[PDB]
Amino acid sequence: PGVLKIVKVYLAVKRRIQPGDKMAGRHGNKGVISKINPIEDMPYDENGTP
């Protein structure tokens, strides 16, 4: 009875990955990212796929 009108607003935000974001497998090996390396700096095998 005090209320006369109600309005509700929804926002959406796309969160990306970044150094501090926590990542883990499903064997219990957790961790925190440390550096987002550029493509050419990662180790690559004989066929060039990093």
Binding site: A12, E40, N47, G48
Partner: protein, 308 residues
């Protein structure tokens, strides 16, 4: 004393896969050139990728359009992978209109003057009824490296109307590159090296042009090493004092104590300028009155004083 490598025996496996051969090379230069060229080619290769997309009926990337099978998010993800080659332009607009049943592919996009679609079988959306139509405009640019949509703000220097869906850009055509070194077929020399580079791109850039561009970039960077050598601000201040609308008995006294700027008057603490001859208690308040009218409270502390 060193043989100069030459570009010879360039062949293409497919429209994307390519092999490039550099036959004459010395002992240690094969690996050095291979790694440097791989890093240059992967890091910074000019290319073209979709920058923004405007669809007629949508309002935001998290909406659903009636008559299509995919959400607008998936349509944007599909467009992000579009491969297009432009010539002589850098802000080219692509329009796409289609009505009917079935997949809508990149071949439907209206034929622009100088725009080549490397692959036209690239499905981007599906129309699932007879009476639904899609009409959308794609603005595609030219760039160098990965640039997220979020990190660009200069595009908001001009206000963007609602309906502009910003997408991320990649700009890098070279998806994969590997190199290898082998013993050369030259028999007159004791032993020579031959370098083979395989590159898998999106088809936007020719392999030979890529190798030439990488070599030019490396040479330009080396040009630095070829010769080493090398072996009080706000407009309110810096303003002459003869504008504060001061009294006559102040002007001569103000000039007598070498106060020619507004700022140096502010830096005078209260207890010390009262020692000035004929300053005047009522007059001093008037200086404090008109100076505080500008918001400059007496007794501020500056670091350096320019002479202008």
């Amino acid at each position: 004393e060193f043989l100069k490598p030459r570009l010879v025996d360039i062949e293409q496996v497919s429209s994307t896969h390519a092999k490039v051969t550099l036959e004459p090379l010395e002992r240690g230069f094969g690996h050095t050139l291979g790694n440097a060229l791989r890093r240059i080619l992967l890091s910074s290769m000019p290319g073209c990728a979709v920058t923004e997309v405007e669809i007629d009926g949508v309002l935001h990337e998290y909406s659903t359009k009636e008559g299509v099978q995919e959400d607008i998010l998936e349509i944007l993800l599909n467009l992000k992978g579009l491969a297009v080659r432009v010539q002589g332009k850098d802000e080219v607009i692509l329009t796409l209109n289609k009505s009917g049943i079935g997949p809508v592919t990149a071949a439907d996009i209206t034929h622009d003057g100088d725009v080549e679609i490397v692959k036209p079988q690239h499905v981007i959306c599906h129309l699932t009824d007879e009476n639904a139509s899609i009409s959308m405009r794609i603005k595609v640019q030219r760039g160098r490296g990965y640039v997220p949509a979020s990190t660009r703000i200069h595009s908001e220097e001009d206000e963007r109307p609602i309906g502009r869906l910003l997408v991320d850009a990649c700009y890098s055509p070279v998806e994969r590159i590997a190199y290898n070194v082998e013993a050369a077929r030259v028999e007159q020399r004791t032993d020579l090296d031959k370098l083979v580079i395989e590159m898998e791109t999106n088809g936007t850039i020719d392999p030979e042009e890529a190798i030439r561009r990488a070599a030019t970039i490396l040479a330009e960077q080396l040009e630095a090493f070829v010769d080493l050598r090398d072996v009080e601000f706000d407009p309110i201040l810096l303003r002459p004092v003869d504008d504060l609308e001061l009294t006559v008995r102040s002007a001569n006294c103000l000039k007598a104590e070498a106060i020619h700027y507004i700022g140096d008057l502010v830096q005078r603490t209260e207890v010390e300028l009262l020692k000035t001859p004929n300053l005047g208690k009522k007059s001093l308040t008037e200086i404090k009155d008109v100076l505080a009218s500008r918001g400059l409270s007496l007794g501020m502390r500056l670091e350096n004083w320019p002479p202008a």
